[PDB]
Homo-oligomer: A and B are copies of this chain.
Amino acid sequence: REMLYLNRSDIEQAGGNHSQVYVDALTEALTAHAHNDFVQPLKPYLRQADRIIAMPSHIISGIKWIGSKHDNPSKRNMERASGVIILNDPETNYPIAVMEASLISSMRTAAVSVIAAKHLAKKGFKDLTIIGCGLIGDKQLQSMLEQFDHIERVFVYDQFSEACARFVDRWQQQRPEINFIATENAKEAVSNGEVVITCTVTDQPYIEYDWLQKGAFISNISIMDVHKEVFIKADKVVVDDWSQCNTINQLVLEGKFSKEALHAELGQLVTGDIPGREDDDEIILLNPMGMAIEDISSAYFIYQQAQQQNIGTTLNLY
């Protein structure tokens, strides 16, 4: 009969503006993923970059209906990403919540890098690199700083020079004790990063393998940024879901990659079925496609926190 509506402001008020709830949710989500206690159908892409993608899954059940188009910050002064998340009571399959998706999507994706870095980043890394200063990049940086205490330098690059400058400026004001560096190109930023996170909207790869320091960990969030050579030269390659990944497909289609060469799925690192980083020289690549269970678990946790604090707008269905 009733559904709770939670806009971005309600989500922020409920605690969705901090990484810890997303870390807990994904730790739960990825654990269930490693034990196959999920139902995650292949996402259909609705295309007229420019796309709308339905991400349904069961762990709670639900779906993320997130739209995107590149023209947005450029032409219409709107965020690229936008959409809604529906939560369903598995006992009933009736919808129980309608929630804004973009903030949750960005924070959970930031939590992916956090959990992965916990297992894959080198010990006592100090230099963090952020490529792309959009909503994703901002949340990636926010979450890393909240979860890792001794991040000392942050290298930032964005194709948009003003977007990068504005990004660096306000973050330098938020954390005056941390040295934020605005780089002239991607190479400088990547070269100086012990942990590298890609948060761009490109189709063509640019990150070369020799840019990466020994012992570096790269969280390839935006996926397309990384050259094929990194997949074959990295000491360890980690994905979220192998079946989902099949850029890797063509490497498998060609005589260049396979599941046997894959180190682990992210859920296996969490459960401790497979070790993470095993020495300080290893270059490790994370290639997450994003999973619907990550959004549903996150939204569900936030939904509960909102209800406990009586946050949100109650809607009637009939």
Measured CB to CB, the residues of A under 8 A from B are 5, 7-9, 39, 41-48, 50-52, 54, 56-58, 61, 63, 65, 67-69, 72, 76, 78, 82-84, 86, 88, 90, 92-95, 98, 100, 313, 315-318
Contacts and interface: CB of A to CB of B under 8 A. Distances in A.
Contacts of A69: 92-93
A298 to B, nearest CB: 18
Given A5-B315, A316-B7, A93 B65 contact: no
Contacts of A95: 65, 67, 82-84
22 contacts: A39-B48, A41-B44, A41-B45, A41-B54, A44-B54, A46-B58, A48-B61, A52-B63, A54-B56, A56-B65, A63-B65, A65-B65, A67-B88, A67-B92, A67-B93, A67-B95, A68-B93, A69-B93, A82-B317, A84-B95, A98-B98, A313-B315
A160 B71 CA distance: 55
A11 to B, nearest CB: 10
Contact of A318 (B8, B67, B313): B8
Given A82-B94, A94-B82, A95-B84, A100 B317 contact: yes
Contacts of A90: 48
A318 B56 contact: no
B46 A56 contact: yes
A40 to B, nearest CB: 9
A94 B65 contact: no
A237 B68 CA distance: 40
Nearest to A100: B317
Most chain-B Cβ atoms within 10 A of its Cβ — which of A8, A69, A94, A100? Answer: A94
Most chain-B Cβ atoms within 10 A of its Cβ — which of A44, A316, A317? Answer: A44
Contacts of A5: 5, 315
Contacts of A100: 317-318
Nearest to A93: B67
A256 to B, nearest CB: 29
Contacts of A51: 93
Given A76-B92, A82-B94, A86-B84, A63 B54 contact: yes
